[PDB]
Design a protein around this ligand. Sequence first.
Ligand SMILES: O=S(=O)(O)O[C@@H]1[C@H](O[C@H]2O[C@@H]3CO[C@@H]([C@H]3O[C@@H]3O[C@H](CO)[C@H](OS(=O)(=O)O)[C@H](O[C@H]4O[C@@H]5CO[C@@H]([C@H]5O)[C@H]4OS(=O)(=O)O)[C@H]3O)[C@H]2OS(=O)(=O)O)[C@@H](O)[C@H](O)O[C@@H]1CO
Ligand SMILES: O=S(=O)(O)O[C@@H]1[C@H](O[C@H]2O[C@@H]3CO[C@@H]([C@H]3O[C@@H]3O[C@H](CO)[C@H](OS(=O)(=O)O)[C@H](O[C@H]4O[C@@H]5CO[C@@H]([C@H]5O)[C@H]4OS(=O)(=O)O)[C@H]3O)[C@H]2OS(=O)(=O)O)[C@@H](O)[C@H](O)O[C@@H]1CO
Ligand SMILES: [Ca+2]
Ligand SMILES: [Ca+2]
Ligand SMILES: [Cl-]
Ligand SMILES: [Cl-]
Lengths: 447, 447
Amino acid sequence: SKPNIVLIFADDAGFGDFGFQGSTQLKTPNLDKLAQSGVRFTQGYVSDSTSGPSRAGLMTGKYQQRFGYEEINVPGFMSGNSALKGADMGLPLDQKTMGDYLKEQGYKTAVFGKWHLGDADRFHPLKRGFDTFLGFRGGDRSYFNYSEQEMKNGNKHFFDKKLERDFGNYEEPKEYLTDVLGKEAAKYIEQNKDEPFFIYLAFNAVHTPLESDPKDLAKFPNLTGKRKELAAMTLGLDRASGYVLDKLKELGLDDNTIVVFSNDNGGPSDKNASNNAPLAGTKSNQLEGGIRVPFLISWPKHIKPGSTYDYPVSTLDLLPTFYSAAKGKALGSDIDGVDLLPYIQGENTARPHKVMYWKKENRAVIRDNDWKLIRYPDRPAELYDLSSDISEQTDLAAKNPERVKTMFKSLFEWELTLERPRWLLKRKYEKYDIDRMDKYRLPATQP
Amino acid sequence: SKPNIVLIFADDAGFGDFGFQGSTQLKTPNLDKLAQSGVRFTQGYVSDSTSGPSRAGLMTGKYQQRFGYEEINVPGFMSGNSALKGADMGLPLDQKTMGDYLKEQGYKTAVFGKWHLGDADRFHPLKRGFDTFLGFRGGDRSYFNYSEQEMKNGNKHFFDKKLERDFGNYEEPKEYLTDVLGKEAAKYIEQNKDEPFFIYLAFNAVHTPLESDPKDLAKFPNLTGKRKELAAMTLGLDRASGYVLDKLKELGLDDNTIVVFSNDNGGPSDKNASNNAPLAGTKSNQLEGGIRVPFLISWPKHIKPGSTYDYPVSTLDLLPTFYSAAKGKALGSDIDGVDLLPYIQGENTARPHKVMYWKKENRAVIRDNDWKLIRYPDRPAELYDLSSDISEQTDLAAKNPERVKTMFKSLFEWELTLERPRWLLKRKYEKYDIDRMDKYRLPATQP
Ligand SMILES: O=S(=O)(O)O[C@@H]1[C@H](O[C@H]2O[C@@H]3CO[C@@H]([C@H]3O[C@@H]3O[C@H](CO)[C@H](OS(=O)(=O)O)[C@H](O[C@H]4O[C@@H]5CO[C@@H]([C@H]5O)[C@H]4OS(=O)(=O)O)[C@H]3O)[C@H]2OS(=O)(=O)O)[C@@H](O)[C@H](O)O[C@@H]1CO
Ligand SMILES: O=S(=O)(O)O[C@@H]1[C@H](O[C@H]2O[C@@H]3CO[C@@H]([C@H]3O[C@@H]3O[C@H](CO)[C@H](OS(=O)(=O)O)[C@H](O[C@H]4O[C@@H]5CO[C@@H]([C@H]5O)[C@H]4OS(=O)(=O)O)[C@H]3O)[C@H]2OS(=O)(=O)O)[C@@H](O)[C@H](O)O[C@@H]1CO
Ligand SMILES: [Ca+2]
Ligand SMILES: [Ca+2]
Ligand SMILES: [Cl-]
Ligand SMILES: [Cl-]
């Protein structure tokens, strides 16, 4: 029987900022129970440390740099020299999505919340294998309704923040957006309970702006400023996820539903007070704190409850995992991900990925087993043993010069399989990305 | 009195491949006498190790990466994702050229031979401060006439190879192109002998294809294959330069004429059998063999004959040097070059450039005094003391880790002042550039 698939994909959450990730300060009871119901990945990665490229990898099961989706698509932030600007930046139309693949297997498909895979009509979710959409095309938006005046006074890219149903039916949220998105996903489950369905629940929680339900803020009297907002926004993310998980149980769909929880990129600790403990770094850098994310898979009667899987896995793996579960027999020859199920169930004791890569311009990483080489524009390449140094504080480059040379050559061989980028950020953002990395160069710790 | 200015700019010549550069195999009598007539620079550099970007720096007196002219403009070789392709790649129109500056000082201005600063009409020499043109818009062409049929049946970029007078008056060369270009420059001197003139004589010699006057091939009976052609093509370059130098002497203009000889980039030893002795590397890499070039300045009664100048200088310096000689008092505030005359004459004993930079994508160089840091995509950054190690064979990076870190930060600070590139080569050419560098990693030696 073809299982339902629910992918809950948070935005800008701290690695440490869930109960199941070791938080005692924040409250995530619903997602903690999801963790206990299935397998928790201790080394789950996104394909990039920023939103657009991460989502391009997730949606395609491919290294997004292979189709030139290398730097983040941010209308108004792009170089005057960029090949594509504004609404023309998007997931190339020749790429086949997770939605397209599950549509081939007869699934009902919906996306709720953040898209960020292009603002033009041709890049719209309903053109990319999704039946149904309630969300926003761009990278961020308010958790409450925009006034008519705010929409009138927005710059030429502001339209991508407007809450939208399907193909251009604009209507602002009537309550806290996190609750709207969760309730919509639960309504869609109810409407499609008799047929295989795929939901992509792309919460904007816990992305800026720092806005919360006042009742949620009240539950954190001992937290201050940004961290109090993050706590409240996290409680909202967890409650809204709860609407979906509870609806599945209520309708008896638990045994025949795959639920995934992950996060688009590492926490931007300076922006939303996210905490990536015990990792160094943040959003937009390639330290573990930027690329390693909370990662759960639940499939009752198929995946052992309360289990952990400790070899590296990728958001790139989700497309082939979902497609195989959906009884798909025509996977494209170009997929970088692997079906995780044989690995999760111990049929395959090998690493799903011996070698993994990250790249934004001159900043790149090659990982070989637990060896991690990090290349930078502004400092010598660093080598970490992640099996003894999760926080990347002990540079072993000088002690292992032959391994550094061999990993450098392997990194460049992979770079040679990539397209040149399709769009380029203004020069100044490389300084912002590196300066924040140096601000969070030390390990984060649970408060 | 405003001096005449003649800039002879060869293409793809080997560093060692002139008598005045230490060759005992090749014949360059005319240019050897030019060297003896003036100052020879032992550390003269182009702004890039390839044609288009080198010429953009030369024409502007600016780091060409500041206006996004970073990778070479080669129609048909560009990424399908490139922002600008074919005829649209060119020196940005908001840049002010060497021609424009000397036109302001009342000079007659001419360019003969290779342009390579854009194929579209708007990038044409007669739009960029040149009165007159006989040459070709693109990067290479035959040293003999193309048939009407060859020109009709060429790909969509082939038109940029056609020999052109002024604004689209096409006529193929009636003899060996090197002789045509020299004789045209000599005719222009004759026509303008009573008025200040500037000639940019951009020979395609000694660029591929390997075609020579049979009478020149006859002067090298003991050489074979590519090296014989290079020898013959070099003798032609020297004779054609001779037409110009002999015309200046014949008309008594020697004492009031600045003559410069240089070369667009290091020798592509695999392509035209050029020899960069005693340097390592070649065209398209940032070893000394790619970026250091033969560099002569003659101004009889102003520059001491038979002298050498040993501090680093740049083609970027030629615009301000020329403009100051032309009595210009309104240099732009954006010029990276300096007027060399005070340095040559000992009015300024300081280094003209304490710091110099090169950049193509991930490949970059910072030089601080005689320290050279080289960054690569596929290997650890290398550090050379050029005052003890001209051939870049003793990597000091491990011995001097703090200097490596300091120069890395300074390199990135300069990168932050640049635009993103305006066009991007196909990915595969980075493999070709690096593999050839490794083929010529050892010092070249005089045959
Ligand atoms: O006048 S404005 O007050 O500032 O009006 C406000 C709203 O506009 C703003 O909206 C947010 C906040 O500031 C600007 C915009 O932020 C930018 O949003 C981008 C969305 O794509 C992007 O965020 S991201 O998607 O999460 O990556 C930008 O962040 C990136 O910038 C670089 C590229 O990658 C990283 C950086 O290197 C990434 O940084 S990060 O990792 O830290 O996130 C982010 O800066 C502003 O938008 S604007 O269009 O520029 O004006 C306006 O819409 C609203 O109506 O009013 C408010 C004021 O009340
Ligand atoms: O069958 S052919 O021999 O190909 O036909 C010939 C003519 O077409 C060719 O002409 C030459 C030979 O092959 C192509 C062309 O070479 C390319 O010319 C470019 C000019 O811009 C460029 O040279 S460059 O300007 O000096 O840089 C290309 O070299 C570069 O390529 C990459 C970019 O930088 C470097 C590389 O990474 C640089 O390499 S290098 O440093 O070694 O110089 C060079 O490959 C081909 O032209 S075509 O546009 O591809 O078709 C044809 O017109 C004529 O009619 O027939 C001849 C054969 O008789
Ligand atoms: Ca995000
Ligand atoms: Ca050249
Ligand atoms: Cl984001
Ligand atoms: Cl060239």
